[PDB]
């Protein structure tokens, strides 16, 4: 068996959602911000947001909504986790003591269901009679909000329309009414139903179906003054309410898909819309007076306000202050002004909230020779893409290097006192037949530049037609100085060539230090790339020189330096090249038993291969023979997101289901069959998407070693910005900390009353296994935050093993010491 | 695709056994003894009739590729029955086959098994499996005797007499090379043809074509009477040479 | 000739890697040196020799050489490790069963989460599988273990059934001793859970039905660890075994022994209301409790769902 420890170094930084209401008091305006697994509660003031409370939940936050049922003084909070843990929460403050009350809770998972394409949707009735949940195709689940439903029991109504795009509870109906956009073979349509709690079924809805834009995306419920719904698409915005129908199709929105919306005015006259290129629009509802005294909708208007960070969620807050919640960039506070500035913008940025964003790749480097080490991350996407220098202080000091284009891979080349960074920028097919970039970015603002002239794929004789307006990726290798982070050089790869892998190393007897890039020729027609390059560059005296190119018959997804040889994975094949005295790559040997060789790592003569399915494989280079040998494979099927080697026998993996697992050589050796079975000895539900594993630690080594129970250090980056750390334990230290977790889980009160053991259980749609071989360090480090009575309660009746005192009864203080040393690893 | 498992009578004078100096009578005797050994051993163990036959068929096939002077017959027989049990889903532990073989063989005969009877048997399986070319599935005259008899209608007692008399002839033909000469379907017909001649029964009348004198042709196309008569002659020789007479 | 099995040497294949851990040995992927054809070699180890050549392998060799259908995995030949000459006893080398190489297994496609099945894909899948089951069942061979792991799929969309080990003949007129505990718990029929040792060819239909529901949810339908917990999940959906729907349930060994929590009512149609009706009718019939009322393979092919599918497309 194996024993490992996993802690968070940086909590999730990306806003997954944001809603505002009156949660902490009936009087204050609150902004609730939801980062993955983390809930931040702020109070809106004219000066700014005042933080008041932050809690963690043992679950990924999928639904977050505020509702005030009749009889309550203040808003309550509904949350549904991605594992289908539902709960209703209340803020209660007894003077200084702030606590989150679990008013109702339960798990709403169905034994039989098909998870929907557009993900979990949760909506609440305007009268707060029921909670609507769309969890499975063809089913609508209703949690009725009656005082007695403390377990959140619910029933399913059969839904004829299997492929639902979006649904909202409509305002202004005699009965609870839902409005949804659905897709069937005839296109997309907007339809309504009424929900009957008494009959527990749908009844015919208030207004007829209308077939809508093919790419209709969002349903906006319109307040009672107007009523009805607005349907936002790629080209058109439409309002449907009974017989009334309006359609505005302004060309400005066609340019970029609109993804988020929020209500500025409770009357619904003003709405906010944002798009993927980061623009912010105002959607205006023009109202017409009636002879009856009634108010009808006259027309819709769209006005461009300015540019924000690419936003997942928007909330209007107060005055002109809007909170921009971004998962692809920094979240922001912006001010909307009545008068535009001299550039024509009505938007002025106030504050910038740091988001490490998607961490596509990262490396650890000792820039200042301090011995500590610093973390340089490829963070963000599109214009929000940037490099982030992250270093320990307790609070992490983070310098931001905007790139304004998508960074892909980073590697450090000390000889050249600079970084190599692969990047991709979006250009659009223009009337010239070429392409035009939307915004200047790193690859265009380099000091000196070059472009590949390779004739390898010029043969052509196969067509690829272009239509004006279509996006393309242009990939570049960026040379960036390690002190100034000035873009010294930019190399643009071939048309339709993607840069997938990057390394910095010397090869063979060649003393020159090279940048080597592995590429793929990506044409929309091909399921799998069938052409590719390995390119050897040299950065010398401010210019990048192409040294050698090797044509391959696939995509070079991953490369790694291997004892002076170049180890590269081309589709299924894993290949070892030698670097000749003629400065050319020569193939030595191959391994072909792979579906897709996405990830590679090495240690000595051993190689760990990560696969699209079939998880990880331990290869070995056999120098006596000049070829590879399969040592052991993990037969259990998994979809890998990143892999790392812990030691000569233990191997770490990351799944696309947000799970971490560890495999070990079976070290039985009785039969060859046992040797070739990597046995999963560690299973852990992380809750984040791990893109990159990287050996190192950000802690300052005082250059004198002081012992820590943990041994080894692997850092990892995630899509939501989390930076975590994995380390190994001795059997004894694991059992002590494991035993203590079980004690801590009985003592600590969870938000939503979510069992910790459940949360960390390995989970795919098909499997759920209990965690094993992993210590949830974030639980362990919470011992230092529980009240003294609880500290002693946790440590009651404790012993120990493998020590000077063979069994050691613990004092609360004894453990306080052990945990505090554990907090020093990050 | 599939191998051919049938030789001509004339070809049998060139078995390895013949060419190592064994005369035709001796190979025939060895064949009957090995077959009756498989038959008797499996019967003591309670085995289905197909399992016995399958073992016997493997055994007869084996000594078309090997010599009786280099591969002892009772060891071979035991191995055949062992594999036959696994093929036909009537399996037995090798030790039990040895136990029964020792009960039935004298001290000289059991000498063929050497110092370690089980090992000598288990070792042959590799050779047997290669010799039979891994064509494990085998059909036997029994199933066709019943498939064909089911389409004969008339005097219940006369048809039952034919079937049992013929069934006896099938058991006896396992002691011969007929298993190697003609497909099992012909054997089933041949035994029906013979029983009919011995019981003075005219099988034609019970067929759906009562004036088709050549009744077999509705069961087995393209079988000359010559073949059925040759088979009959070979089955009867065993009865004439032994003290045993036609069952009737 | 092509029929002289057991003599060709495994030298003729370049071993590419280990595709899987097998029952009677490990399974490897390989390229034929002469033709360049990718094959899969199943190792048969008799070095243990506890009972010699394994029976599980003997079943797969006896049956798969007789069965030739598009949807049944083809055994191409049997090859051996280098055989030392002049010591027929000393050789302990292993034999290898050569099969065609199938790109993926359904379980792996599903476990990795990499596939999406539209209604038409499920039609093409089931039509091939059940047509193959009809071929095997018409030949009176029962593929007692049917799971996702045993259904192999090429990128071409061809489905082929595999691992015909644990498969035996069934006399239609009579019944003999049978093993009873013969399918994986997730895909086991209720009859075998209650201990029937005279299993019908319908044991396989239940498994293929479990798969049919699995293909519409991407999750197995009956997931339990213990035989009782399994009967309970089946009963929550199909109703509790009782003479009202399964007269002979009382003749089965453990009917009194293994009662579910309640005498549930059948909800199959309700919990699967999202499935197309053509399919739901097929599922409802395939997952019938009584082995005698459970549809046959031929009947599934003569269903509104699978009858009019063109396998050319
Ligand atoms: C019982 C063992 C496995 C379980 O799936 N069965 C299995 N699987 C096959 N291929 C699917 C997986 C291919 C694969 C696996 C691992 C790594 C990589 C790169 C690829 C297969 N092809 C042919 N056969 C014949 C022998 C019946 C097969 N039998």
3-state SS, one letter per residue, for A684-745: EECCCCEEEEEECCCCCCCCCCCCCCCEEEEEEEECCCCEEEEEECCHHHHHHHHHHHHHHH
User: Ligand 1 within 6 A of C61 CB?
Assistant: no
Residue of A nearest to C17 (CA): A593
Ligand 1 pocket: which of C19, C67, C79 to mutate (most atoms within 8 A of CB): C19
**3-state DSSP assignment of residue B14:** helix
- β-sheet with A347-353: strand ranges across: A313-315, A321-325, A331-336, A347-353
Q: A288: number of CA atoms within 13 Å, CB side?
A: 7
Residue whose CA is closest, atom 25 of ligand 1?
C99
Q: Which residues of chain A make contact with C114, given a CB cutoff of 8 A?
A: 612-613, 639
- Which residues on chain C are in Cβ contact (under 8 Å) with B3? 1, 3-4
Q: How far apart are CA C166 and CA C170, in angstroms?
A: 13
Ligand 1, atom 1, lies closest to the CA of C22
User: Alpha-carbon distance B206 to B217, whole Å?
Assistant: 14
Pocket mutation for ligand 1, best pick of C13, C29, C76, C105 (most atoms within 8 Å of C-beta): C105
Nearest to A651 by CA among A608, A691, A697, A693: A608
Q: Does C239 map to a domain?
A: yes
Of C75, C100, C125, the residue at which a domain comes to its end is C100
CA distance C75 to C102: 12
Choose which residue among A571, A591, A594, A595 to substitute to test ligand 1 binding: the one with the highest number of ligand atoms within 8 A of its C-beta: A595
Q: Give a yes or no: residue C297 inside a domain.
A: yes
Asked if residues A655 and A680 have their Cβ atoms less than 8 Å apart, the reply is no
How far is residue A471 from each of residues A256, A462, C266, measured CA to CA in Å? 11, 20, 53
Give the number of C-alpha atoms closer than 13 A to the C-alpha of residue A33, restricted to the C-beta side.
29
Contact C26 A591 (CB under 8 A): no
Instruction: Tell whether A354 is within 8 A of chain C (Cβ).
Output: no
Cβ atoms A315, A305 nearer than 8 A: no
Indicate the Cα dihedral angle A336, A338, A339, A343, nearest 10°: 30
| Residues 6 or more apart whose Cβ sits within 8 Å of residue A531 | A457, A520, A521, A551, A552, A553, A554
The dihedral of CA A459, A463, A464, A468: what is its sign? positive
C34, C167: one domain: no
Backbone angles phi, psi at B84, to 5 degrees: -55, -40
Distance (Å) from CA C108 to ligand 1 centroid: 10
Strand A177-184 versus strand A187-196 pairing type: antiparallel
Shared domain check, C134 and C219: yes
Other CB atoms closer than 10 Å to residue A798's CB: what's the count? 17
Q: Is residue C129 one of the residues assigned to a domain?
A: yes
Which of A666, A599, A588, A676 has its CA nearest to residue A631? Answer: A676
**What does the angle CA B179 – CA B185 – CA B189 come to, to the nearest 5 degrees?**
100
- In total, chain A counts a number of residues equal to 826
Complete domains list, chain A, with CATH: 4-353 (2.130.10.10), 359-728 (2.130.10.10), 731-823 (1.10.150.910)
- Whether residue C308 is contained in a domain is answered as no
3 state SS of B53:
helix
Are both C72 and C173 inside the same structural domain?
no
Burial of C88 (0-12, 13-18, 19+ CB in 10 A): middle
Give all strands of the β-sheet with A359-365 in edge-to-edge order: A359-365, A374-379, A386-391, A397-402
Establish whether C137 is an annotated binding residue. no
CA A289, distance to chain mean position in Å, is 47
DSSP conformational letter for C102: P
Q: Is A696 exposed, middle or buried (0-12, 13-18, 19+ CB in 10 A)?
A: middle
CB contact under 8 A, C51 and B135: no
Boundary residue ending a domain (C100, C134, C153): C100
Tokens of A736: 């002590």
Q: Which of A111, A632, A675 to mutate to test the interface with C (most CBs of C within 10 A)?
A: A111
Q: Is the domain of C73 the same as that of C149?
A: no
Instruction: Choose one of C70, C100, C130: the last residue of a domain.
Output: C100
CB A192 within 8 A of CB A177: yes
Suggest the residue from C22, C39, C113 to mutate for an interface test with chain A (most A CBs closer than 10 A). Answer: C113
Two tokens, residue B97 = 């086959």
Residue C144 sits in the same domain as residue C293: yes
Give the whole-angstrom CA distance, residue A263 versus residue A299.
17
Instruction: Give the residue before each break in chain A, using a C-to-N cut-off of over 2.5 angstroms; say none if it is continuous.
Output: 393
- Is residue A661 within 8 Å of A655, Cβ to Cβ? yes
C104 marked among binding-site residues: yes
Rounded alpha-carbon distances, angstroms, from residue A645 to A9, A222, A648, A796, C123: 20, 54, 8, 38, 43
Interatomic CA distance for residues C30 and C11, integer angstroms: 11
Q: Under DSSP, is residue A666 helix (H, G, I), strand (E, B) or coil?
A: coil
Pairs from B203-209 (Cβ < 8 Å, separation ≥ 24): B203/B152, B203/B162, B205/B154, B206/B152, B206/B153, B206/B154, B206/B159, B207/B151, B207/B152, B208/B151
Note whether A54 and A41 are within 8 A (CB).
Answer: yes
Residue pair A787/A116 in contact (Cβ under 8 Å)? The answer is no
Q: Are B52 and B170 in contact (CB under 8 A)?
A: no
CB A376 within 8 A of CB A388: yes
Cα(C18) to centroid(ligand 1), Å: 9
Instruction: Judge whether C113 and A656 are in contact, CB under 8 Å.
Output: yes
How many CB atoms lie under 10 A from the CB of residue A689?
20
C84 and C126 fall within a common domain: no
Name the DSSP class of A823. Answer: G
Question: Is residue C13 within 8 Å of C41, Cβ to Cβ?
Answer: yes
Task: Check if C154 contacts A (Cβ < 8 Å).
Answer: no
Name the phi and psi angles at A84, rounded to 5: 70, 25
C15 among the known binding-site residues?
A: no
Query: Which residue segments constitute the domains of chain B, with CATH numbers given?
Result: 1-137 (1.10.472.10), 138-248 (1.10.472.10)
Q: Which residue has the tokens 């498939």?
A: B147
User: Whats the size of chain C, residue-wise?
Assistant: 313
Which residues on C lie below 8 Å from A115 (Cβ)? 218
**For the residues of A558-618, what is the DSSP string, one character each?**
EEEEETTEEEEEETTEEEEEEE-TTS-EEEEEEE---S-EEEEEEETTEEEEEESSS-EEE
Helix (H) or strand (E) holding A550: strand A543-552
C66 among the known binding-site residues? no
Residue A296 contacts residue A244 (beta carbons within 8 Å): yes
- Atom of ligand 1 lying closest to residue C97 CA: 26
Contact present, A595 and A572 (Cβ < 8 Å)? yes
CB contact at 8 A, A710 and A729: yes
C293 interfacial to chain B (CB closer than 8 Å): no
A610 close to A594: Cβ distance less than 8 angstroms: no
Going along A197-242, which residue ranges are E strands?
201-204, 210-212, 218-221, 229-232, 237-241
Contact B133 C1 (CB under 8 A): no
- CA dist A589 and A573 (Å) reads 10
Sequence-ordered list of residues with C-beta below 8 angstroms from that of C69, at least 6 positions apart, any chain: C131, C132, C135, C136
Rounded CA-CA distance A711/A732 in Å is 13
Taking alpha carbons only, the member of A77, A86, A88 closest to residue A17 is A77
- Could you tell me the resolution of this structure in angstroms? 3.4
Residues of C in contact with A613 (CB under 8 A): 104, 108-109, 111-112, 114
Contact between B134 and B126 (Cβ < 8 Å): no
Q: Is A69 helix (H, G, I), strand (E, B) or coil?
A: coil
Spatial contact of A265 and A285, defined as CB atoms under 8 Å apart: no
Breaks (C-N over 2.5 A) in chain B follow: none
Cβ of B129 and C88 within 8 Å?
Answer: no
Q: Is residue C165 assigned to a domain?
A: yes
Distance of CA A274 to the CA centre of its chain: 20
Q: Round to whole Å and give the CA distance between A531 and A523.
A: 10
Q: How far is CA A672 from CA A65, A634, C45, C97, in A?
A: 56, 15, 12, 19
Whole-number Å distance, alpha carbon C150 to ligand 1 midpoint, is 9
**Distance between Cα C148 and ligand 1 center (Å):** 12
Tell me the technique behind this structure.
X-ray
The answer, for C91 touching chain B at a CB cutoff of 8 Å, is yes
Q: Would an 8 Å CB–CB cutoff place A68 in contact with chain C?
A: no
Pick the catalytic residue from C84, C91, C145, C248: C145
Does residue A231 contact residue A201 with C-beta atoms inside 8 Å? no
Classify residue C11 by its DSSP letter.
G
Query: What per-residue string of b and e applies to A409-438 under the rule 16 or more CB within 10 Å gives b?
Result: bbbbbeebebbbbbbbbbeebeeeeebebb
* Touching, B vs A (3+ Cβ pairs under 8 A): no
- Same domain for C83 and C145? no
Strand partners, A304: A281
- Can you list the alpha helix ranges (DSSP code H) found in A21-161? none
- Does residue C4 belong to any structural domain of this protein? no
Report the number of secondary-structure helices (H) and strands (E) in chain A.
7, 62
Please tell me whether residues C208 and C64 are part of one structural domain. Answer: no
C24 carries a ligand binding annotation? yes
- Ligand 1 atom 21: residue of nearest CA: C102
Q: Where are the alpha helices (DSSP H) in C20-69?
A: 55-64
Residue A698: alpha-carbon gap to chain centroid: 22
For ligand 1, is residue C101 a contact (CB within 6 Å)? yes
C209 lines ligand 1 (CB under 6 A): no
Sort out which chain A residues have CB atoms less than 8 A from C104's CB and list them.
595, 613
The whole-angstrom separation of Cα A588 and Cα A563 is: 13
Q: Are C79 and C98 in contact (CB under 8 A)?
A: yes
Report yes or no: C27 and C53 within 8 Å, Cβ to Cβ.
Answer: no
- End-to-end Cα, chain B, rounded Å: 43
Q: Which residues contact B239 (CB under 8 A, 6 or more apart)?
A: B172, B245, B246
Question: Does residue C42 sit within a domain?
Answer: yes
Query: Rounded distance, CA A183 to CA C164, Å?
Result: 42
- C28 and C112 assigned to the same domain: no
DSSP SS3 for A143? strand
Q: Which residues have a Cβ under 8 Å from the Cβ of B154 and sit 6 or more positions away?
A: B205, B206
C29 at interface of A, judged by CB pairs closer than 8 A? yes
Which of A335, A338, A313 lies closest to A324, judged by CA? Answer: A313
Q: For residue A462, how far is its CA from the centre of ligand 1 (angstroms)?
A: 36
Q: For residue B86, give the nearest of C55, C78, C95 by CB distance.
A: C55
Query: Could you tell me which of C255, C261, C227 has the C-alpha nearest to residue C243?
Result: C255
Contact criterion met (CB below 8 Å) for A558 and A501: yes
C40 ligand 1 Cβ < 6 A:
yes
Going by the DSSP 8-state scheme, the letter that residue A755 receives in this structure is -
Residues on chain A touching C233 (C-beta within 8 angstroms): 111
| Bridging pattern class, strands A640-645 and A627-633 | unpaired
Q: How far is CA B103 from CA A19, A118, A707, B29, B37, in A?
A: 89, 76, 75, 21, 12
Taking the Cβ of residue B125 and every Cβ of chain C, the question of whether any pair is shorter than 8 Å is answered with: yes
Q: Clarify whether C145 is annotated catalytic.
A: yes
Residues 6+ apart with CB under 8 A from C89: B123
- DSSP SS3 for C22: coil
The rounded distance, in Å, linking the Cα atoms of C259 and A614 is 40
| Tokens 């532990």 found at | B93
Count Cβ atoms below 10 Å from residue A316 Cβ, excluding itself.
18
What would the DSSP string read from start to end of A409-472? Answer: EEEEEGGGTEEEEEEEEEEEE-TTSSEEESS--GGGS-SEEEE----SSTT--S-----TT-EE
Q: Examine the domain organization and report whether C90 and C137 are in the same domain.
A: no
Compute the distance between CA of residue C221 and CA of residue C284 in angstroms, rounded to an integer. 13
- C-beta neighbour count of B133 within 10 angstroms: 19
User: The tokens of C62 are what?
Assistant: 């006896």
Answer whether C228 touches B (CB < 8 Å): no
- Known binding residue C101? Answer is yes
DSSP state of A753: G
**What CATH number did the domain enclosing C171 receive?**
1.10.510.10
User: Hey, is A535 helix, strand or coil?
Assistant: strand
Task: Supply the DSSP symbol for B204.
Answer: G
- C-alpha C285/C-alpha C301 separation (Å) is 13
* Ligand 1 in reach of A594 Cβ (< 6 A): yes
Query: Distance, CA C74 to ligand 1 centroid (Å)?
Result: 13
CA distance B40 to A670: 42
Distance separating alpha carbons of residues A416 and A478, to the nearest angstrom? 13
Domain tally for chain C?
Answer: 2
Alpha carbons C127 and C133: distance in angstroms, whole number: 10
Q: Please check whether residues C148 and C271 belong to one and the same domain.
A: yes
> Strand pairing partners for A66?
A77
C169 inside domain: yes
How do beta strands C159-161 and A187-196 pair?
unpaired
Give me the numbers of helices (H) and strands (E) for chain C, helices first please.
Answer: 9, 10
Residue ranges making up the domain that contains C289: 104-303
- The answer on whether C27 is annotated among ligand-binding residues is yes
In this structure, what CATH number is given to the domain that contains residue C56? 3.30.200.20
Q: Which chains touch C (3 or more CB pairs under 8 A)?
A: A, B
- Say how many CA atoms lie within 13 Å of B79 toward its Cβ: 29
Atom of ligand 1 nearest to the CA of C22: 1
Please say whether the beta carbons of C266 and C238 come within 8 A. yes
Interacting residues of C53 by C-beta distance below 8 A, sequence separation 6+: B83, B86, B125, B129, C44, C46, C95
Long-range contacts of A397-400 (CB under 8 A, 24+ apart): A398/A354, A398/A356, A400/A354
Question: Could you identify the residue written with the tokens 């509104």?
Answer: C304
- The per-type count for chain B, helices as H runs and strands as E runs, is 12, 0
Say yes or no: C125 and C220 in one domain: yes
Nearest to A647 by CA among A727, A562, A737, A566: A727
Pocket perturbation via mutation, ligand 1, pick of C102, C143, C184 by most ligand atoms within 8 A of CB = C102
Residue A328, Ramachandran bin (φ over 0: left; ψ between -120 and 50: alpha; else beta): alpha
**Who contacts C129 (Cβ-Cβ below 8 Å, separation ≥6)?**
C71, C151, C159, C161, C208, C211
């Amino acid at each position: 068996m194996s024993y490992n420890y996993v802690v968070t170094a940086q909590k999730p930084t990306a806003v997954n959602g944001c809603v505002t209401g009156h949660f902490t008091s009936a009087e204050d305006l609150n902004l609730l911000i939801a980062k993955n697994t983390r809930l931040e509660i702020y109070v809106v003031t004219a000066e700014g947001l005042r933080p008041v409370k932050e809690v963690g939940m043992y679950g990924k936050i999928a639904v977050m909504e505020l509702f005030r049922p009749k009889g309550e003084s203040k808003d309550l909070l509904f949350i549904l986790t991605a594992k289908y843990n539902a709960c209703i929460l209340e803020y209660k403050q007894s003077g200084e003591s702030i606590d989150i009350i679990t008013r109702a809770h339960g798990n709403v998972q169905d034994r039989i269901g098909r998870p929907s394409e557009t993900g979990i949707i949760g909506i609440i009735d305007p009268e707060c009679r029921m909670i609507g949940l769309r969890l499975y195709d063809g089913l609508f689940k209703v949690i009725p909000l009656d005082r007695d439903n403390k377990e959140l029991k619910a029933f399913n109504i059969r839904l004829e329309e299997l492929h639902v795009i979006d649904v909202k509870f409509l305002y202004g109906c005699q009965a609870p009414t839902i409005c949804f956009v659905y897709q069937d073979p005839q296109g997309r349509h907007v339809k309504t139903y009424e929900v009957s709690l008494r009959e527990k079924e749908f009844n015919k809805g208030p207004w007829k179906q209308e077939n809508v834009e093919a790419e209709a995306s969002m349903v906006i419920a319109v307040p009672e003054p107007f009523g009805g719904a607005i349907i936002i698409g790629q080209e058109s915005i439409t309002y449907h309410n009974g017989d009334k129908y309006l359609a505005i199709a302004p060309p400005i929105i066609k340019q970029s898909t609109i993804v988020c919306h929020n209500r500025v005015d409770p009357n619904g006259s003003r709405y906010l819309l944002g798009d993927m290129e980061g623009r912010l629009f105002m959607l205006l509802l023009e109202k017409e007076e009636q002879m009856d005294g009634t108010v009808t909708l006259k027309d819709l208007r769209v006005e461009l306000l300015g540019e924000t960070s690419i936003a997942e969620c928007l909330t209007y807050l107060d005055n002109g202050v809007v909170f921009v919640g971004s998962r692809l960039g920094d979240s922001q506070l912006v001010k909307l002004n009545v008068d535009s500035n001299e550039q024509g913008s009505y938007v002025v940025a106030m504050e910038t909230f740091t988001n490490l964003g998607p961490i596509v790749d990262m490396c650890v480097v000792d820039l200042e020779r301090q011995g500590q080490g610093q973390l340089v991350t490829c963070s963000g996407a599109f214009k929000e893409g940037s490099l982030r220098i992250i270093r320990n202080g307790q609070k992490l000091h983070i310098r931001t290097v905007p790139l304004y284009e998508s960074p892909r891979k980073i590697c450090y080349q000390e000889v050249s006192q600079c970084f190599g960074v692969l990047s991709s920028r979006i250009e659009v097919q223009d009337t010239s037949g070429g392409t035009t970039a939307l915004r200047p970015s790193a690859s265009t603002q380099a000091l000196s530049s070059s472009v590949s002239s390779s004739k390898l794929f010029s043969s052509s004789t196969a067509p690829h037609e272009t239509s004006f307006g279509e996006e393309v990726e242009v990939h570049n290798l960026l040379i960036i100085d390690q002190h100034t982070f000035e873009v010294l050089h930019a190399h643009q790869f071939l048309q339709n060539e993607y840069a997938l892998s990057l390394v910095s190393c010397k090869l063979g007897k060649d003393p020159n230090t090279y940048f080597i890039v592995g590429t793929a020729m990506v044409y929309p027609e091909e399921a799998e790339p069938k052409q590719g390059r390995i390119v050897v560059f040299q950065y010398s005296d401010g210019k990048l020189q192409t040294v050698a190119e090797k044509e391959v018959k696939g995509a070079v997804y991953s490369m790694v330096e291997f004892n002076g040889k170049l180890l590269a994975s081309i589709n299924s094949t894993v290949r070892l090249y030698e670097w000749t005295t003629e400065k050319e790559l020569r193939t030595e040997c191959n391994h072909y038993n792979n579906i897709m060789a996405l990830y590679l790592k090495t240690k000595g003569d051993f190689i760990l291969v990560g696969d699209l399915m079939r998880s990880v494989l331990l290869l070995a280079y056999k120098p006596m023979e000049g070829n590879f040998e399969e040592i052991a494979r993990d037969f259990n099927p998994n979809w890998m997101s990143a892999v790392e080697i812990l030691d000569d026998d233990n191997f770490l993996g990351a799944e696309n289901a947000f799970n971490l697992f560890v495999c070990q050589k079976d070290s039985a050796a009785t039969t060859d069959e046992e040797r070739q079975h990597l046995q999963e000895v560690g299973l852990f539900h992380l809750g984040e998407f791990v893109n990159v594993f990287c050996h190192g630690s950000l802690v300052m080594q005082n250059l004198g070693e002081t012992s820590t129970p943990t041994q080894g250090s692997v850092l990892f980056g995630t899509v939501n910005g989390m930076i975590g750390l994995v380390t190994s334990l001795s059997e004894s230290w694991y059992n002590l900390l494991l035993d203590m977790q079980n004690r801590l889980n009985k003592v600590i009160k969870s938000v939503g009353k979510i069992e910790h053991s459940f949360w960390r259980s390995f989970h795919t749609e098909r499997k759920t296994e209990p965690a094993t071989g992993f210590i949830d360090g974030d639980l362990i480090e919470s011992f230092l935050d529980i009240s003294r009575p609880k500290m002693q309660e946790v440590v009651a009746n404790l012993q120990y093993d493998d020590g000077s005192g063979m069994k050691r009864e613990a004092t609360a203080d004894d453990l306080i010491k052990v945990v505090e040393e554990l907090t020093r690893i990050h | 695709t599939k191998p051919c498992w049938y030789w001509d009578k004339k070809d049998l004078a060139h078995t390895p056994s013949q060419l190592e100096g064994l005369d035709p009578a001796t190979e025939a005797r060895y064949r009957r003894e090995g077959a009756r050994f498989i038959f008797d051993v499996g019967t003591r163990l309670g085995l289905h009739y197909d399992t016995l036959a399958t073992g016997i068929i493997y055994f007869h096939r084996f000594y078309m590729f090997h010599s009786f002077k280099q591969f002892p017959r009772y060891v071979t027989g035991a191995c055949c029955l062992f594999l036959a049990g696994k093929v036909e889903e009537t399996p037995k532990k090798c030790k039990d086959i040895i136990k029964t073989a020792r009960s039935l063989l004298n001290d000289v005969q059991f000498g063929q098994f050497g110092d370690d009877p089980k090992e000598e048997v288990m070792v042959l399986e590799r050779i047997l499996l290669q010799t039979i070319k891994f064509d494990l599935q085998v059909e036997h005259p029994y199933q066709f005797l019943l498939k064909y008899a089911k389409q004969l209608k008339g005097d219940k007692n006369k048809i039952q007499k034919l079937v049992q008399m013929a069934w006896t002839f099938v058991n006896d033909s396992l002691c011969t090379t007929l298993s190697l000469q003609w497909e099992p379907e012909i054997i089933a017909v041949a035994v029906m043809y013979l029983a009919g001649r011995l019981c003075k029964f005219e099988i034609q009348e019970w067929t759906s074509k009562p004036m088709y004198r050549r009744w077999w042709e509705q069961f087995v196309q393209d079988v000359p009477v010559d073949v059925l008569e040759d088979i009959c002659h070979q089955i009867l020789d065993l009865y004439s040479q032994g003290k045993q007479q036609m069952p009737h | 000739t092509e029929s002289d099995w057991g003599k060709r040497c495994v030298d003729k294949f370049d071993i590419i890697g280990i595709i899987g851990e097998g029952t009677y040995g490990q399974v490897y992927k390989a390229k034929d040196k002469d033709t360049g054809e990718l094959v899969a070699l199943k190792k048969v180890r008799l070095d243990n020799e506890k009972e010699g050549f394994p029976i599980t392998a003997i079943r797969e060799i006896k049956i798969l050489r007789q069965l030739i259908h598009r949807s049944v995995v083809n055994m191409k030949e049997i090859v051996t490790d280098k055989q030392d000459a002049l010591d027929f006893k000393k050789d302990k080398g292993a034999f290898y069963l050569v099969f065609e190489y199938m790109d993926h297994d359904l379980m792996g496609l599903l476990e990795s989460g990499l596939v999406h099945f539209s209604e038409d894909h499920i039609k093409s899948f089931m039509k091939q599988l059940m047509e193959g089951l009809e071929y095997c069942h018409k030949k009176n061979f029962l593929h007692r273990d049917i799971k996702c792991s045993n259904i192999l799929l090429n990128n071409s969309g061809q489905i082929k059934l595999a691992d015909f080990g644990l498969a035996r003949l069934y006399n239609s007129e009579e019944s003999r001793p049978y093993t009873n505990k013969v399918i994986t718990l997730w895909y086991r029929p209720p009859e075998l859970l209650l201990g029937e040792e005279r299993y019908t060819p319908a044991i396989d239909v239940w498994s293929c039905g479990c798969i049919l529901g699995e293909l519409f949810t991407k999750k197995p339908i009956f997931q339990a660890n213990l035989e009782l917990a399994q009967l309970e999940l089946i009963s929550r959906l199909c109703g509790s075994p009782c003479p009202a729907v399964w007269p002979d349930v009382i003749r089965l060994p453990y009917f009194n022994t293994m009662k579910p929590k309640k005498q549930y009512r059948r909800r199959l149609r309700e919990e699967f209301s999202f499935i197309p009706s053509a399919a739901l009718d097929l599922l409802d019939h395939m997952l019938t409790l009584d082995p005698s009322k459970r549809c046959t393979a031929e009947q599934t092919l003569q269903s509104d769902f699978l009858k009019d599918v063109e396998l050319s497309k």
